[PDB]
Amino acid sequence: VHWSIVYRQLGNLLEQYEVEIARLKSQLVLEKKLRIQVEKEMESVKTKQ
Amino acid sequence: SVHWSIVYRQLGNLLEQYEVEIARLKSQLVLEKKLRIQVEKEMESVKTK
Amino acid sequence: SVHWSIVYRQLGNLLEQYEVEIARLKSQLVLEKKLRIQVEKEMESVKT
Amino acid sequence: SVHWSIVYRQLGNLLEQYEVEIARLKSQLVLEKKLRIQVEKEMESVKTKQ
C-alpha cells in the first residue's frame, strides 16, 4: 500500500510525542514546586519546637 | 541541493530523541511523585507529634 | 532549532517529487521507444 | 503496536529504490534518444542522396 499512509502515521506519532512531552514537563515542574513547598513548611514547623 | 538521506536521517533522529525524552521524563516523574509522597507522609507525622 | 514539522514536510516533498519523476521518465521512455521503433522500420524500408 | 522504526526503515528503503530507479530510467532514456537521433540523421542524409 502507498507510502503516504505510513508517512502520515509517522507524522501523527510526532504530534503525539510533542504534546506528551509538553504535558510531562508541565506535570514535572508542578509536582516539584508543590513538594518543595511542603518540605519548607515542614522545616519551619519543626523549628517551632 | 541536499541528498535525501540527510533529511531522512534528521527525521529519524527526531523520532528517536522524542521517544527517549519521553521515557526519561516519565522515570523522572515516577521519582518526583515518590519524593512528594515521602515528604507529605513525614509532614503528616510531624503534624501529629 | 527547527520544528520537527519542517523536516517531516521536506521528506514528504522528496518522496512525492521522486514518485512524480519516475512516472514522468517512464511516460517519456514509452514515447521515445515508439519513435525509435518507427524510425528504424522506416530506415529498413529505405535501405531496399 | 509496531515500532515506528520498522515503518521508517521501509520508507528509507523505498527512497533507495527510487533513487536507483531514477538513475536507471534516465540512463535508458538518454541512450534511446541518442540512438534514435543517430538513425534519423542517417536516414536524412541517405534519402537526400537517392
Labels describing this entry:
90% helix; DNA endonuclease ctp1 (chain B); 1 helix; mainly alpha; homotetramer
Task: Describe the protein.
Four copies of one chain form a homotetramer. In chain A, 90% of the residues lie in helices and 0% in strands. Chain A has one helix spanning 3-46. The longest helix of chain A has 44 residues, at 3-46. The first copy, chain A, is rod-shaped, with a radius of gyration of 22 Å. The termini of chain A are far apart. The A-B interface holds A 10, 13-14, 17-18, 20-21, 24-25, 27-28, 31-32, 34-35, 38-39, 41-42, 45-46, 49 and B 11, 14-15, 18-19, 21-22, 25-26, 28-29, 32-33, 35-36, 39-40, 42-43, 46-47, 49. Chain B: It comes from Schizosaccharomyces pombe (strain 972 / ATCC 24843) (Fission yeast). Chain B: Interacts (when phosphorylated) with nbs1; promoting recruitment to DSBs. Chain B: It is found in: Nucleus; Chromosome. Chain B: Belongs to the COM1/SAE2/CtIP family.
What is the CA-based Rg of chain A, rounded? Answer: 22 Å
- Tell me the domain tally of chain A: 1
What is the assembly state of the chains in this entry?
homotetramer
Counted by DSSP, the helix tally of chain A is: 1
Largest contact between protein chains?
A: A-B, 22 and 22 residues
Q: For the terminal residues of chain A, how far apart are their CA atoms?
A: 73 Å
Largest pleated sheet of chain A: none
Could you tell me the strand content of chain A as a percent range? under 5%
Total number of β-strand segments of chain A? 0
Look at the helices and sheets of chain A and give the structural class. Answer: mainly alpha
Report the helical percentage of chain A.
Answer: over 70%
N-to-C series of helices and strands of chain A? H
Please tell me what the overall shape of chain A is: rod-shaped
